[PDB]
């Protein structure tokens, strides 16, 4: 009789899986991979699209709260930023200060309620917007440092999953954004070869 | 370039499909489904273990409204009341006529923000409580009366779910409650032949 965990998956359309026509994304395969590792895992997708970390800082802790409990095992991943960098009217939709002040205010919170790993932004080429990868870079060095700071683990999949792996390729020949199961699927890999989902699984 | 769609399913451990070990459920298979007829679906897995209907009143408009807006096509589908019916100190969770209550308020609210469809309870044999089918049974019928009244189509799965399905025997082989690929694979073939479903897809 296998042991159970609740995992809640907090973001943006990249944890939602968004452009995977397996409706899998690659929460859902480490998950299918955890239950292959004998847990009964119980997961709880709770990625939105165009989610900033302003949003996510907003509705996260009540709709976690509803899912998870100290009576089981639970553990909280986030994964956001990609929206924070998409430039509106020529101005990033929050900027890098306010995005480092929301990630440490929900990991302050969260570290004092559950487990709680971070995943960084993955790779998004948009046409009118070259400076968009050096913003994205510049973004998840200051993640990993607040992440440093506070013990929570920070899984870096960027360079990762820039070429020659496929994510680009299959969000190119789909809506220029979302890969498909291919990409998905490269990103559960690197999740599953991770220490700290190593070591806490 | 195929029409997006965004689904939002809410309800209890069917709805997120607990027991799959291939961490789609039903929900996850029907848009699998509606990805091969040509849309592109943004899947939004609101179910919660152990929910009733009073718990799903007091959240589900909050949730929805985050993820559905007017400016895309929108659906919200629900399916709950077997926390309902559960006995703890020998009396039901919510009362029949609370289960109604509730029911009325969360579709009448739903009917005039999103198009909205609803689904019965699945079969569960609970040992210690062999009055729980009729209880079921008798609830069913009453949500369908309300369906009715409010011209929101109701799926009753209940019957077609019984035996010589393979859902019972899966649920028995796993923890008692929950099935397995089998169970949830033919809980999404009833849904994808419903003609409320394919009327509107």
Chains 1, 2 share one sequence.
Not at 38 to 66: C, F, H, M, P
Not at 95 to 124: D, F, G, H, W
Not at 136 to 157: E, G, N, R
Request: net charge neutral; charged share 25%; aromatic share 10%.
């Amino acid at each position: 009789s296998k042991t159970q965990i609740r995992i809640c998956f907090v973001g943006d359309s990249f944890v939602n899986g968004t452009g995977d026509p397996e409706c899998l994304g690659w929460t859902g395969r480490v998950c299918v991979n955890a239950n292959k590792k004998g847990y009964d895992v119980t997961y709880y997708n709770l990625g939105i699209r165009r989610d900033t970390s302003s949003d996510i800082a907003k509705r996260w802790l009540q709709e976690v709260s509803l899912r998870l409990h100290k009576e089981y095992n639970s553990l909280v991943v986030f994964s956001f930023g990609l929206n924070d960098t998409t430039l509106e009217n020529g101005k990033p939709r929050v900027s890098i200060a306010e995005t480092i002040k929301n990630t440490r205010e929900i990991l302050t919170q969260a570290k004092k309620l559950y487990p709680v790993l971070m995943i960084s932004p993955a790779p998004y080429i948009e046409q009118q917007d070259p400076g968009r990868r050096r913003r994205t870079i510049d973004l998840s060095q200051q993640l990993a440092l607040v992440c440093q700071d506070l013990d929570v683990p920070y899984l870096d999949v960027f360079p990762l999953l820039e070429k020659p792996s496929v994510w680009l390729h299959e969000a190119k020949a789909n809506d220029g954004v979302h890969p498909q199961a291919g990409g998905y699927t490269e990103f559960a890999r690197i999740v599953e070869n991770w220490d700290a989902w190593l070591n806490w699984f």
